[PDB]
Design a protein around this ligand. Structure first.
Ligand SMILES: c1csc(-c2ncc[nH]2)c1
Length: 281
């Protein structure tokens, strides 16, 4: 059981050691499309790239590239798209991908500004009456409603395909209280946030994969997906304690590099799963 393994690593203070072994054991696959010169300005960080095998392709004939990865968890019957914070230039591309993958939810784990820098373009409208048009990708985005709470905000958006006049409701789940440095003290509000996303049906197989992003789409994003998947496998399996979070993390890392950036995020993920297991059992 992971609870006892938690105390072990914690009492021994071995988090940097565990984390380093995971770094060592992680998959490395080609990312040739990410590195093409024509895609240089479609990437926020030069050392964060989608693998070619799991990358999301845009259905535009010109350049199909976006910094985004499909993570398929076969046993848990869960899929996620992990992507970077859109850039000023890639906001049209981001919404094109939401449209093409038939996603119902966007999950954002960063503020637009953190540490006095921009982590992310402002990619949704701030007022009902000021909708956004993406001329490059022929989409229109309207804020329908906005429910602001202590730890997070939920926004209903309408996405319209200007080409075909089809519309879809997209839910934007925005966790607004992740601290600028380190990880939250308690996983309580993060679990609450995870339960709210699940309840929306955005993680459900009747929809395309949820889109999850922070700035790089690997650190906080990773914690989101790792916690969701581990909790789901604890429901599914005959023996819930068969679930090894290190194994699950290594299976997710086949799909996107660098998921969980720090030993702190690793520890927080254990704590999120351990605490969420109580509510589930
Ligand atoms: C941060 C990293 S790259 C970037 C950017 N790309 C295009 C405009 N601003 C902002």
């Amino acid at each position: 059981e992971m609870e006892k393994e938690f105390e072990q690593i914690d009492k021994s203070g071995s988090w940097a050691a565990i984390y380093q072994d995971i770094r060592h054991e992680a998959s490395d696959f080609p990312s040739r499309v990410a590195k093409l010169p024509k895609n240089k300005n479609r990437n926020r960080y030069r050392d964060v790239s989608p693998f070619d095998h799991s990358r999301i392709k845009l259905h535009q004939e010109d350049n199909d590239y976006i910094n985004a990865s499909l993570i398929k968890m076969e046993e848990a019957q869960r899929s996620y798209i992990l992507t970077q914070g859109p850039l000023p230039n890639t906001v049209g591309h981001f919404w094109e991908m939401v449209w093409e993958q038939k996603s119902r939810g966007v999950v954002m784990l960063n503020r637009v500004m953190e540490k006095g820098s921009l982590k992310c373009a402002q990619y949704w409208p701030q007022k009902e009456e000021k909708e956004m048009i993406f001329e490059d990708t022929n989409l229109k985005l309207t804020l329908i409603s906005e429910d602001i709470k202590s730890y997070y905000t939920v926004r209903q958006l309408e996405l319209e395909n200007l080409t075909t006049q089809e519309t879809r409701e997209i839910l934007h789940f925005h966790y607004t209280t992740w601290p600028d440095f380190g990880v939250p003290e308690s996983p309580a509000s993060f679990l609450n946030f995870l339960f709210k996303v699940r309840e929306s049906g955005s993680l459900s197989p009747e929809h395309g994969p949820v889109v999850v992003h922070c700035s790089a789409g690997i650190g906080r994003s990773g914690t989101f997906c790792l916690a969701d998947t581990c909790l789901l496998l604890m429901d599914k399996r005959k023996d819930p304690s068969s679930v090894d979070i290190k194994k699950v993390l290594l299976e997710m890392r086949k799909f996107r590099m660098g998921l969980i950036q720090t030993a702190d995020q690793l520890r927080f993920s254990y704590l999120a799963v351990i605490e969420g297991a109580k509510f589930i059992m």
